[PDB]
Amino acid sequence: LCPVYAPFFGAIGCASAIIFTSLGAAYGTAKSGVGICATCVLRPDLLFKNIVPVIMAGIIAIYGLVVSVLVCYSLGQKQALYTGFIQLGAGLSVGLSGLAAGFAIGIVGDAGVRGSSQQPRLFVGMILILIFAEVLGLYGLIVALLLNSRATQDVV
Amino acid sequence: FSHFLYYLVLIVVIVYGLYKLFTGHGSDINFGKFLLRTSPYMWANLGIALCVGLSVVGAAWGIFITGSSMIGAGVRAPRITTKNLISIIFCEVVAIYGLIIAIVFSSKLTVATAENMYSKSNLYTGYSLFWAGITVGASNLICGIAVGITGATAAISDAADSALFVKILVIEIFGSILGLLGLIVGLLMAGKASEFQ
């Protein structure tokens, strides 16, 4: 009921919470940085206005960090296999959804900062689409927190 | 991504084989007992179905290869569209080969008694029908594709000059040797195989 190979799933859930959110945040930072460093050569005044897709990418990695710390502080040697399965699910829920949120933030941020220098009114539309792209990772954060709140609830 | 799965399955097979071999249990990966204990009707029905399936996927393959180029080559020269249908016919006969071998194989497909079910003869006639369905379906597949290619070249060389179709029909003859040779070999393989008893 609480076997020896049970914290393997918890360690993979602690790893995958930060690994895939860092992959998503790294895709978002790379795409948005290629966008910024190609749109702020000619328009350097709106350089610090365009760093918002990179911040939205970094909040995805913060979401992964929080879940990985909370799964890390619930590991144990003699824990249940249910706890390991819930921690694996909570790691994957935030990781493979923050990866998708990072893909969306990178694509929207590149396409929005390459066209926001031409049209100044497109910035409040880019922020509005990136809010919907960052709520995609906030949903995985909520699912991971609700899973990890029940990892040790009625456990023998 | 398919190369990643080809490498992953290979790594899992090597790790499982070396784990099973190092721990002194390497004879548990037992392909001979797998062959002895699986049902002979699997091999027999799978051979019949793959015979008539892979003959047809070669016949239909050759039919579109020398059909689409026949219709393309017949736009300027429409006097090929009936004479050159023998290239459809030569790649269509490889399906009737697989059909008349699948029915002869399914004649050897009865209900075997459970007391002599994994016997010598019942397992022999599962193995024989399996590989004699494979060697007919695959041979008719490859023959249908080869006759389709050498008919697609013939359908355009016919529209070029009329005297070339007679010269390049010979290549279709040498290509259609192959399905008849598979027809022979699949009847020799399941020639001594008895019914399921």
Binding site: - | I134, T153, L164, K167, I177
Partner: protein
């Protein structure tokens, strides 16, 4: 009998199928790829076609090479006689070393005897060299058939 188990004809009929399928695959590659080159010169100098049917005939001989060994494996398979696993492994090997031999020889004849026939419409002195390279590429399957015949007579 521990040397003649009941799963041994699996590897003998596998030898039949590997001797037939791969040899007719090589014969079909050799006749189709070369018939492409023969029909390609159908308009430019049509009189050199009936002389150039030699890489089709030498490709068709590669199916006879597989036919002979498929008949000689299928003649040693009977449900009433004893059939050793040594014999089954040996028939698997003699079909397997003639199937890929005729496959490679058919690939070689197909790649040689369409380039040669396709360049032969320019230079009419190529034909002796074309026939010579086809003989060197057609003895490749004869080597495998020799190994298959010696291996069949050894394993029975």
């Amino acid at each position: 009998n521990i040397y003649a188990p009941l799963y041994a004809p699996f590897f003998g009929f596998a030898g039949c199928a590997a001797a037939m399928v791969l040899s007719c695959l090589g014969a079909a590659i050799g006749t189709a790829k070369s018939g492409i080159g023969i029909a390609g010169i159908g308009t430019f100098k049509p009189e050199l076609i009936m002389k150039s049917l030699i890489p089709v005939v030498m490709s068709g001989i590669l199916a006879i090479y597989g036919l002979v060994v498929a008949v000689l494996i299928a003649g040693n398979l009977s449900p009433t006689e004893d059939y050793t696993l040594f014999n089954g492994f040996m028939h698997l090997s003699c079909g397997l070393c003639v199937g890929f031999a005729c496959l490679s020889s058919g690939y070689a004849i197909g790649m040689v005897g369409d380039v040669g026939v396709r360049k032969y419409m320019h230079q009419p002195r190529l034909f002796v060299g074309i026939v010579l390279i086809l003989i060197f590429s057609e003895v490749l399957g004869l080597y495998g058939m020799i190994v298959a015949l010696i291996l069949n007579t050894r394993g029975s």
